[PDB]
Amino acid sequence: GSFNELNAINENIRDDLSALLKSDFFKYFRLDLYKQCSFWLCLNRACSVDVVEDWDTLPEYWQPEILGSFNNDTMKEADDSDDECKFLDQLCQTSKKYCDVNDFNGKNAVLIDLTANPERFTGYGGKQAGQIWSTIYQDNCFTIGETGESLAKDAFYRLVSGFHASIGTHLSKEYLNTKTGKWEPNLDLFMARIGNFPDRVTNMYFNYAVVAKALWKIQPYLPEFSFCDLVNKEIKNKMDNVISQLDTKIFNEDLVFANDLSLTLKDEFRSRFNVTKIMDCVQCDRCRLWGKIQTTGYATALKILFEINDADEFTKQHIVGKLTKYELIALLQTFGRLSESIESVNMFEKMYGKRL
Ligand SMILES: Cc1cc2nc3c(=O)[nH]c(=O)nc-3n(C[C@H](O)[C@@H](O)[C@@H](O)COP(=O)(O)OP(=O)(O)OC[C@H]3O[C@@H](n4cnc5c(N)ncnc54)[C@H](O)[C@@H]3O)c2cc1C
Ligand SMILES: *[C@H]1CC(=O)N(CC)C1=O
């Protein structure tokens, strides 16, 4: 139903949002090169690759190991500057008067160029990918009795499903032609993973709205976090420009059941998203990267929607101001993946059409 509204909203914003995301302020993400998979899991390529291609047939430089690796030359040393670790509060000086101070405990953290490391088909899959998605869905268990118990599990599942579908949609749009050696849409794959499962398409639009509602809820309390940055002076404005075009009646609906969830159920829900931790179990480097960015994006969104819910102007202003640049980056980059996933659906529907 409301599908059309989000599509309208998304088309009016696709360009501005893509430009914003390529800015120096949003183009980099802090990622710990060392990973601690503490939840364990199949490790051999024999069970980590997708059957979609007959790999033994393709050239070496087209194997999942290369398709999913970073573009070496695309990651500067991090924590050499604590900019990403600072609060929006403290990016610019509001009046004449942090990676350690704010908890970024990364062994060997680095800044990866997301513009040079887009999410796309990598060939990752098999039992491993299956074991991971499986564990996330199976970790949808809250404290029984608690008010809004059911609702909490429905939202958790839906968010994960939309995240899952968004990736599937993505690897489908940006698929590799093992003959032309060109990246191009793969309608058949889209149809097999997302196309023929309405609920999965719905969940992406669910995630799209959840994240868009968060950006819209913080807009009024955003600190003037960029006027001082000589390079990124306009970023804050350019973000307001996007967020402002996001207003929709859909935001009236309590998407994450904030007004129906126990105050402890809300923390459990926040704790489940942990989902960000399993991401370190993802052996495909680019998948880990974007997985981590999106899970952090959702966890950020949940925090915003849950906390700002109880309101209190002083508090609201604090909640958004004490949000870290790292979180805002994750949040807006997650919105960027959703925006593109929604666009890709419309493309595939029109592609599925010309097929006749
Ligand atoms: C966090 C993470 C990030 C990843 N990132 C990338 C990436 O950038 N690029 C790339 O090539 N691959 C990526 N993958 C791999 C991808 O998600 C694969 O598992 C896939 O292409 C191989 O798909 P599959 O058919 O074996 O199953 P999937 O399609 O993962 O199958 C899992 C199962 O869950 C169900 N399922 C599928 N979609 C949904 C849904 N939306 N909601 C509820 N259930 C669903 C299916 O019925 C099936 O039983 C990632 C994996 C993980 C765990
Ligand atoms: C979480 C709670 C529970 O009992 N299960 C089944 C093993 C879960 O997935």
mmCIF file of N, CA, C and O and ligand atoms in Angstrom, residues 50 119-125 129 132-133 137 157 161 163-165 167 171 193 200 279 282 287, ligand 1:
data_model
loop_
_atom_site.group_PDB
_atom_site.id
_atom_site.type_symbol
_atom_site.label_atom_id
_atom_site.label_comp_id
_atom_site.label_asym_id
_atom_site.label_seq_id
_atom_site.Cartn_x
_atom_site.Cartn_y
_atom_site.Cartn_z
ATOM 1 N N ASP A 50 28.764 -19.707 -2.730
ATOM 2 C CA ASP A 50 27.431 -19.916 -3.269
ATOM 3 C C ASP A 50 27.543 -20.812 -4.503
ATOM 4 O O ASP A 50 28.480 -20.681 -5.296
ATOM 5 N N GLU A 119 28.983 -2.597 -1.772
ATOM 6 C CA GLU A 119 28.395 -3.888 -1.471
ATOM 7 C C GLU A 119 27.960 -4.420 -2.835
ATOM 8 O O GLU A 119 27.396 -3.679 -3.637
ATOM 9 N N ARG A 120 28.237 -5.689 -3.108
ATOM 10 C CA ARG A 120 27.870 -6.281 -4.388
ATOM 11 C C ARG A 120 28.056 -7.791 -4.332
ATOM 12 O O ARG A 120 28.492 -8.320 -3.322
ATOM 13 N N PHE A 121 27.709 -8.485 -5.406
ATOM 14 C CA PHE A 121 27.853 -9.938 -5.447
ATOM 15 C C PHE A 121 29.318 -10.335 -5.191
ATOM 16 O O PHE A 121 30.221 -9.820 -5.852
ATOM 17 N N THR A 122 29.560 -11.239 -4.243
ATOM 18 C CA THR A 122 30.937 -11.657 -3.961
ATOM 19 C C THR A 122 31.122 -13.154 -4.131
ATOM 20 O O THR A 122 32.242 -13.627 -4.255
ATOM 21 N N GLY A 123 30.022 -13.898 -4.131
ATOM 22 C CA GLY A 123 30.117 -15.341 -4.277
ATOM 23 C C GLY A 123 30.105 -16.067 -2.938
ATOM 24 O O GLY A 123 30.258 -17.292 -2.875
ATOM 25 N N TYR A 124 29.936 -15.300 -1.865
ATOM 26 C CA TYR A 124 29.881 -15.835 -0.508
ATOM 27 C C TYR A 124 28.509 -16.475 -0.316
ATOM 28 O O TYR A 124 27.522 -16.028 -0.892
ATOM 29 N N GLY A 125 28.453 -17.525 0.491
ATOM 30 C CA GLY A 125 27.194 -18.206 0.745
ATOM 31 C C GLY A 125 27.445 -19.553 1.395
ATOM 32 O O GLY A 125 28.184 -19.647 2.375
ATOM 33 N N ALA A 129 27.478 -18.958 5.470
ATOM 34 C CA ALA A 129 26.564 -17.829 5.403
ATOM 35 C C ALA A 129 25.240 -18.281 6.007
ATOM 36 O O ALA A 129 24.567 -17.525 6.718
ATOM 37 N N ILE A 132 25.310 -18.434 9.803
ATOM 38 C CA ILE A 132 25.257 -17.101 10.380
ATOM 39 C C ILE A 132 23.854 -16.498 10.366
ATOM 40 O O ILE A 132 23.369 -16.055 11.408
ATOM 41 N N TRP A 133 23.193 -16.494 9.208
ATOM 42 C CA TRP A 133 21.834 -15.953 9.125
ATOM 43 C C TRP A 133 20.932 -16.754 10.050
ATOM 44 O O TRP A 133 20.058 -16.217 10.730
ATOM 45 N N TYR A 137 18.534 -15.237 13.279
ATOM 46 C CA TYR A 137 17.085 -15.462 13.362
ATOM 47 C C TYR A 137 16.719 -16.291 14.590
ATOM 48 O O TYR A 137 15.684 -16.068 15.212
ATOM 49 N N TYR A 157 12.541 -9.845 14.067
ATOM 50 C CA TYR A 157 12.555 -10.714 12.901
ATOM 51 C C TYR A 157 12.446 -9.873 11.629
ATOM 52 O O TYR A 157 13.230 -10.026 10.697
ATOM 53 N N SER A 161 15.019 -9.617 8.586
ATOM 54 C CA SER A 161 14.542 -10.074 7.289
ATOM 55 C C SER A 161 14.761 -8.983 6.235
ATOM 56 O O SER A 161 15.179 -9.270 5.115
ATOM 57 N N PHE A 163 17.008 -6.643 6.366
ATOM 58 C CA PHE A 163 18.454 -6.492 6.219
ATOM 59 C C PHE A 163 18.928 -7.569 5.248
ATOM 60 O O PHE A 163 19.662 -7.285 4.295
ATOM 61 N N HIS A 164 18.477 -8.796 5.500
ATOM 62 C CA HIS A 164 18.789 -9.977 4.694
ATOM 63 C C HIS A 164 18.385 -9.761 3.224
ATOM 64 O O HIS A 164 19.189 -9.962 2.301
ATOM 65 N N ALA A 165 17.132 -9.346 3.028
ATOM 66 C CA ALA A 165 16.582 -9.112 1.699
ATOM 67 C C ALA A 165 17.318 -7.996 0.979
ATOM 68 O O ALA A 165 17.522 -8.068 -0.231
ATOM 69 N N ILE A 167 20.424 -7.211 1.236
ATOM 70 C CA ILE A 167 21.684 -7.716 0.733
ATOM 71 C C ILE A 167 21.432 -8.573 -0.488
ATOM 72 O O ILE A 167 22.104 -8.414 -1.503
ATOM 73 N N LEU A 171 23.173 -7.963 -4.157
ATOM 74 C CA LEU A 171 24.030 -8.849 -4.917
ATOM 75 C C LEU A 171 23.348 -9.212 -6.246
ATOM 76 O O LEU A 171 24.013 -9.623 -7.195
ATOM 77 N N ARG A 193 15.567 -14.969 -4.995
ATOM 78 C CA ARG A 193 15.863 -14.574 -3.616
ATOM 79 C C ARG A 193 14.844 -13.623 -2.983
ATOM 80 O O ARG A 193 14.468 -13.787 -1.819
ATOM 81 N N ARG A 200 9.458 -10.540 1.874
ATOM 82 C CA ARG A 200 10.825 -10.047 1.875
ATOM 83 C C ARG A 200 10.929 -8.646 1.292
ATOM 84 O O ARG A 200 11.741 -7.844 1.740
ATOM 85 N N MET A 279 28.871 -10.527 13.001
ATOM 86 C CA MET A 279 29.416 -10.036 11.753
ATOM 87 C C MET A 279 30.903 -10.386 11.645
ATOM 88 O O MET A 279 31.422 -10.555 10.539
ATOM 89 N N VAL A 282 31.763 -13.502 9.750
ATOM 90 C CA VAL A 282 31.613 -13.454 8.300
ATOM 91 C C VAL A 282 32.991 -13.432 7.652
ATOM 92 O O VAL A 282 33.700 -12.435 7.732
ATOM 93 N N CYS A 287 31.580 -8.414 2.840
ATOM 94 C CA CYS A 287 30.305 -8.745 3.440
ATOM 95 C C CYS A 287 30.361 -8.370 4.907
ATOM 96 O O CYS A 287 29.374 -7.887 5.461
HETATM 97 C C1 LIG B 1 25.602 -10.617 7.364
HETATM 98 C C2 LIG B 1 25.987 -11.239 6.033
HETATM 99 C C3 LIG B 1 26.287 -10.304 4.997
HETATM 100 C C4 LIG B 1 26.438 -10.779 3.676
HETATM 101 N N1 LIG B 1 26.843 -9.924 2.617
HETATM 102 C C5 LIG B 1 26.926 -10.244 1.220
HETATM 103 C C6 LIG B 1 27.333 -9.416 0.185
HETATM 104 O O1 LIG B 1 27.757 -8.211 0.249
HETATM 105 N N2 LIG B 1 27.499 -9.946 -1.125
HETATM 106 C C7 LIG B 1 27.276 -11.247 -1.544
HETATM 107 O O2 LIG B 1 27.554 -11.914 -2.564
HETATM 108 N N3 LIG B 1 26.774 -11.952 -0.467
HETATM 109 C C8 LIG B 1 26.576 -11.586 0.854
HETATM 110 N N4 LIG B 1 26.170 -12.414 1.884
HETATM 111 C C9 LIG B 1 25.729 -13.707 1.461
HETATM 112 C C10 LIG B 1 24.277 -13.951 1.213
HETATM 113 O O3 LIG B 1 23.385 -13.346 2.187
HETATM 114 C C11 LIG B 1 24.075 -15.421 1.010
HETATM 115 O O4 LIG B 1 23.772 -16.285 2.095
HETATM 116 C C12 LIG B 1 23.642 -15.919 -0.355
HETATM 117 O O5 LIG B 1 23.859 -15.246 -1.632
HETATM 118 C C13 LIG B 1 23.849 -17.333 -0.674
HETATM 119 O O6 LIG B 1 22.423 -17.403 -0.610
HETATM 120 P P1 LIG B 1 21.627 -18.723 -0.342
HETATM 121 O O7 LIG B 1 20.582 -18.957 -1.338
HETATM 122 O O8 LIG B 1 22.498 -19.899 -0.083
HETATM 123 O O9 LIG B 1 20.697 -18.265 0.866
HETATM 124 P P2 LIG B 1 19.996 -17.148 1.716
HETATM 125 O O10 LIG B 1 19.279 -16.585 0.535
HETATM 126 O O11 LIG B 1 20.866 -16.485 2.744
HETATM 127 O O12 LIG B 1 19.282 -18.236 2.612
HETATM 128 C C14 LIG B 1 19.055 -18.291 4.017
HETATM 129 C C15 LIG B 1 17.721 -18.966 4.226
HETATM 130 O O13 LIG B 1 16.923 -17.942 4.888
HETATM 131 C C16 LIG B 1 15.827 -17.649 4.010
HETATM 132 N N5 LIG B 1 15.886 -16.294 3.579
HETATM 133 C C17 LIG B 1 16.516 -15.619 2.500
HETATM 134 N N6 LIG B 1 16.202 -14.350 2.464
HETATM 135 C C18 LIG B 1 15.325 -14.134 3.526
HETATM 136 C C19 LIG B 1 14.605 -13.062 4.097
HETATM 137 N N7 LIG B 1 14.696 -11.888 3.469
HETATM 138 N N8 LIG B 1 13.803 -13.135 5.224
HETATM 139 C C20 LIG B 1 13.616 -14.319 5.854
HETATM 140 N N9 LIG B 1 14.327 -15.408 5.311
HETATM 141 C C21 LIG B 1 15.157 -15.264 4.168
HETATM 142 C C22 LIG B 1 15.814 -18.704 2.889
HETATM 143 O O14 LIG B 1 14.634 -19.439 2.803
HETATM 144 C C23 LIG B 1 16.835 -19.696 3.185
HETATM 145 O O15 LIG B 1 16.343 -20.854 3.881
HETATM 146 C C24 LIG B 1 26.164 -12.201 3.360
HETATM 147 C C25 LIG B 1 25.957 -13.053 4.480
HETATM 148 C C26 LIG B 1 25.858 -12.640 5.819
HETATM 149 C C27 LIG B 1 25.576 -13.703 6.873
#
